[PDB]
């Protein structure tokens, strides 16, 4: 399943 | 060629280019059935040790190499640079999925080594992580639940008498580590007399099993309650109404007192629900106290001629002198038949074990010990387990579905002590 993964250093979309 | 550190699975595997049996090969093991998504190139979030900062922060890392529970990680942005590759237990507490750091509100800090290898990190991570594989949803919950076992301390079970194989006696669960139970006999004769075994060991049974099945038991003369029978491993149901095992039938069996050998054996008793009492010729007390209990579906018993056709050393009767041993001559001398091959028919699982694979294996001669081991032979579902560093004389015959075998890293994960190879 794919979701919108949060990134802090915005968002990226990845498969789990 | 100068090794000045203690043992670690990581360096042991890298140095000799070893291969570890995947967690998949161990049904009984934690996450043994929820492991299909774990693979190489899977991205995770792990603490960034490449920080001069006094605090702790995370970064993205990809799995370079997977050995059991242990995964070799490389920080995202190193590409082919293996300079900072580090080992970890992928089921460890600090390993999270990729959304975990920001959705919880902590900043991803790039390793100090590659801080100026790329300028724009937002664009970097977007290009790298988009459509990338990561950890399944509620994976940390899966790992947590796998560490929670239904067998609780103070539970009473029936287990074989270590010094009197023909009978069972009541033992009590005193401690549970990684699904392994430390049993203590209710009426011990020794100070630290224990019985290490797994939860789903075929050697433990509910209270009343011995009486019900017809198996001998020791008659006895504190918060302890009986184990709920529905917690025990289910035995494969058989049909013993027609043609079945008979007393006197000859067979081959793994000696429970020496798991390195397969011996000429005899059916001594046919019990209920498929269980059988078996003795080894030449090593039987007259009162039948040496008779051990194997189920009919047990992978430890074999039809006559199994060892020969598969080129396995058979242990002839103790004191028997007509060597080399021939079954034909022995059946004539003892006036007996071989148990029909069709009684031993069993499925051979696609276990996924390969010769040379590393794993963590219980010493079956000393269940206390769990040691660095290797699979050296495979006979269908029969595995020859070697303990690294030690003599191959002590290699043990183990079933592929045995709950006494464990993936690489199982000890570190469960907190059990691991024995390193002999010096």
UniProtKB/Swiss-Prot annotation, chain A:
Transmembrane segments: none annotated. It is linked to Gabriele-de Vries syndrome: An autosomal dominant neurodevelopmental disorder characterized by delayed psychomotor development and intellectual disability. Most patients have behavioral and feeding problems, movement abnormalities, mild distal skeletal anomalies, and dysmorphic facial features. This is Transcriptional repressor protein YY1. Belongs to the YY transcription factor family. Proteolytically cleaved by caspase-7 (CASP7) in response to apoptosis. Transiently poly-ADP-ribosylated by PARP1 upon DNA damage, with the effect of decreasing affinity of YY1 to its cognate DNA binding sites. There is a cross-link at residue 3 (Glycyl lysine isopeptide (Lys-Gly) (interchain with G-Cter in SUMO2)). Interacts with YAF2 through the region encompassing the first and second zinc fingers. Component of the chromatin remodeling INO80 complex; specifically part of a complex module associated with the DBINO domain of INO80. Interacts with EED and EZH2; the interactions are indicative for an association with the PRC2/EED-EZH2 complex. Interacts with SFMBT2. Found in a complex with SMAD1 and SMAD4. Found in a complex with YY1, SIN3A and HDAC1. It is found in: Nucleus matrix. The chain holds residues 206 to 225 of 414 of the full protein. It comes from Homo sapiens. Multifunctional transcription factor that exhibits positive and negative control on a large number of cellular and viral genes by binding to sites overlapping the transcription start site. Binds to the consensus sequence 5'-CCGCCATNTT-3'; some genes have been shown to contain a longer binding motif allowing enhanced binding; the initial CG dinucleotide can be methylated greatly reducing the binding affinity. Proposed core component of the chromatin remodeling INO80 complex which is involved in transcriptional regulation, DNA replication and probably DNA repair; proposed to target the INO80 complex to YY1-responsive elements.
UniProtKB/Swiss-Prot annotation, chain B:
One of its GO terms (biological process) is positive regulation of DNA-templated transcription. Coiled coil: none annotated. The keyword Cell cycle does not apply. Its main location: nucleus. It comes from the Eukaryota. MBT repeats lie at residues 7-111, 119-216, 217-317, 325-421. Keywords: Acetylation, Chromatin regulator, Chromosomal rearrangement, Chromosome, Metal-binding, Nucleus, Repeat, Transcription, Transcription regulation, Zinc, Zinc-finger. GO terms for molecular function: chromatin binding; histone H4K20me1 reader activity; histone H4K20me2 reader activity; methylated histone binding; NuA4 histone acetyltransferase complex binding; zinc ion binding. It is found in: Nucleus; Chromosome. GO terms for cellular component: NuA4 histone acetyltransferase complex; nucleosome; nucleus; site of double-strand break. Monomer. Component of the NuA4 histone acetyltransferase complex. Interacts with EPC1; interaction is direct and promotes recruitment of MBTD1 into the NuA4 histone acetyltransferase complex. Chromatin reader component of the NuA4 histone acetyltransferase complex, a multiprotein complex involved in transcriptional activation of select genes principally by acetylation of nucleosomal histones H4 and H2A. The NuA4 complex plays a direct role in repair of DNA double-strand breaks (DSBs) by promoting homologous recombination (HR). MBTD1 specifically recognizes and binds monomethylated and dimethylated 'Lys-20' on histone H4 (H4K20me1 and H4K20me2, respectively). This is MBT domain-containing protein 1. The chain holds residues 135 to 562 of 628 of the full protein.
